Design a protein around this ligand. Structure first.
Ligand SMILES: Cc1cc2nc3c(=O)[nH]c(=O)nc-3n(C[C@H](O)[C@H](O)[C@H](O)COP(=O)(O)OP(=O)(O)OC[C@H]3O[C@@H](n4cnc5c(N)ncnc54)[C@H](O)[C@@H]3O)c2cc1C
Ligand SMILES: CC[N+](C)(C)CCCS(=O)(=O)[O-]
Ligand SMILES: [Cl-]
Ligand SMILES: [Mg+2]
Ligand SMILES: [Mg+2]
Ligand SMILES: [Mg+2]
Length: 485
């Protein structure tokens, strides 16, 4: 007997822990659902919907290979492990690493209790190209900025382990345990709100594989020239899959690396450039783990502390307006609407809306992080923290803090013909392009003809940009003065 503990590595291909267990003797595939253990960050509705469906596909896969997936509902995963071993008679437990704060602690507490109880525990790398400790500078210290970190990752003395085939067969220790704990990921209310997800996404490793294939054989070529497309099938759409380990980044890296060589050979400039940008994307995810591991409280504590005494607005209805997409700035409101209705957002819009959140409204970044975590289909502690810290300016490589982006211009850059804004804001579906990104200027006749009544079915800017720069300054003057102490 041997136990495989699945957490966010929901796949049978290139799964070190699984492969080691099969090598060892029969297996018991286990998954334990213990949200309250996740604190303030228990999975949100759409994330849960994804998990529910991903686990079904996982179970189905495992069965095809010989064993079932045993699910347990509990308040303490560690305890659940013990009761499983102390019922099954397993001697070893294999699992893959996780690098978010909550996982770090629980995992140690797991190794301790289990090993100090007569159980052999082995861990592997299933989620990264290289463990954060393998990537370091010449002196041996962790890099403090992305570029340096990513340049080292790509110039390592050795290649990332190559994708392992899934088992050909699995023997299962005790099949009388297959009928286990039913897991409930939706309440009736939520079932309602989830109804359209199945129409757009197919959770699980099989479909993740399909997505990767689609991407590399299509869109990747124009990945670079499509960086300014707000709502188009120009990206990979692998993030939700990646979050639950349904797809191996090592496999992603291998396929991308083969395309890069082929395109370098052909001297296809667009392709190389697109390959570089996409790799930087994969790079940024790897970096999110790097930072979380090298700063255990990064999901709440900022890296840089130069904004320590900054007087953040704590205005509750500023927040509500942001969530509701009632800020007055078309592109920002369109993004909040798309997120609320679908749980999805292109990276550019995530920057646009989170940027507005910290510079125009000036709310605490933890609030934006939490909302995103509750509503994103690919909600990921590490990637979400990295994103917010970067936008807010608490990262060694954040852009200048005293800079406020103009949604009108962002609108011109990313949504030139107002197609995006009009898709997500029906109230503005009749407004001509000349005013789509700044309706508050538009002549009364155009608004009347469009059915738009400023302040009613579309609000006036909840805070002006000019007025915004001023409070930002006033806020700095204040924090600097608070520093004097
Ligand atoms: C404020 C903010 C919050 C974010 N929150 C999340 C989150 O909760 N979960 C999440 O996975 N990503 C998050 N991101 C990063 C990024 O927006 C998403 O990973 C990306 O939009 C997903 O689309 P894709 O799968 O098509 O990515 P692609 O462009 O196809 O790139 C492939 C993969 O690279 C990784 N990636 C790409 N860009 C980034 C990035 N900027 N940071 C980290 N990883 C990246 C993702 O795994 C992505 O799936 C956030 C970014 C910001 C600015
Ligand atoms: C445009 C990307 N969409 C289709 C919405 C998601 C990709 C499908 S999935 O779930 O198989 O990755
Ligand atoms: Cl500053
Ligand atoms: Mg794009
Ligand atoms: Mg696009
Ligand atoms: Mg970004």
């Amino acid at each position: 007997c041997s136990i495989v503990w699945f957490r966010r590595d929901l796949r049978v291909e290139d799964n070190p822990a699984l492969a080691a267990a099969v090598r060892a003797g029969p297996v018991i595939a286990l998954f334990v659902w213990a949200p309250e253990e996740e604190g303030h960050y228990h999975p949100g509705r759409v994330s849960r919907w994804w998990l529910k469906n991903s686990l079904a596909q996982l179970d189905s896969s495992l069965r095809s290979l010989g064993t079932c997936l045993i699910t347990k509902r509990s308040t303490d995963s560690v305890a659940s492990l013990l009761d499983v071993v102390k019922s099954t008679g397993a001697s070893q437990i294999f699992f893959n690493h996780l690098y978010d704060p909550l996982s770090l602690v629980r995992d140690h507490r797991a190794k301790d209790v289990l090993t100090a109880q007569g159980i052999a525990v082995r861990s592997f790398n299933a989620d990264l190209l290289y463990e954060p400790w393998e990537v370091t500078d010449e002196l041996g210290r962790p890099f403090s900025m992305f570029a340096a970190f990513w340049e080292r990752c790509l110039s390592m003395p050795y290649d990332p382990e190559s994708p392992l085939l899934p088992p050909k067969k699995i023997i299962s220790g005790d099949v009388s345990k297959c009928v286990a704990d039913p897991l409930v990921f939706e309440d009736d209310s939520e079932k309602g709100s989830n109804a359209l997800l199945a129409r757009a996404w197919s959770p699980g490793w099989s479909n993740g594989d399909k997505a990767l294939t689609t991407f590399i054989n299509g869109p990747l070529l124009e990945y670079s020239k499509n960086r300014r497309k707000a709502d188009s099938a120009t990206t990979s759409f692998l993030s939700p899959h990646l979050h639950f380990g349904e797809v191996s980044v090592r496999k992603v890296f291998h396929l991308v690396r083969i395309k890069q060589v082929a395109w370098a050979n052909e001297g296809n400039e667009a392709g190389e450039e697109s390959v570089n940008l996409f790799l930087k994307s994969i790079g940024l995810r790897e970096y999110s783990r790097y930072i979380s591991f090298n700063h255990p409280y990064s999901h709440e504590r900022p890296l840089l502390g130069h904004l320590k005494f900054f007087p953040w607005a704590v205005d509750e209805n500023y927040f509500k307006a942001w969530r509701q997409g009632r800020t007055g700035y078309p592109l920002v409101d369109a993004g909040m609407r798309e997120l609320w209705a679908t749980g999805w957002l292109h990276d550019r819009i995530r920057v646009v809306v989170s940027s507005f959140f910290v510079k125009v409204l000036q709310l605490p970044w933890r609030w934006g992080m939490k909302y995103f975590w509750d509503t994103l289909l690919d909600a990921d502690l590490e990637s979400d923290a990295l994103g917010w810290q970067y936008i807010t300016g608490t990262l060694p490589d954040s852009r200048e803090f005293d800079r406020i982006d103009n949604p009108q211009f962002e609108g011109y850059k990313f949504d030139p013909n107002g197609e995006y804004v009009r898709r997500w804001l029906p109230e503005l579906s009749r407004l001509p392009t000349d005013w789509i990104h700044h309706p508050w200027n538009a002549p009364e006749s155009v608004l009347q003809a469009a059915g738009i009544e400023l302040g009613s079915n579309y609000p006036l800017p909840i805070v002006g940009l000019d007025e915004a720069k001023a409070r930002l300054h006033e806020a700095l003057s204040q924090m600097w003065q608070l520093e004097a102490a």
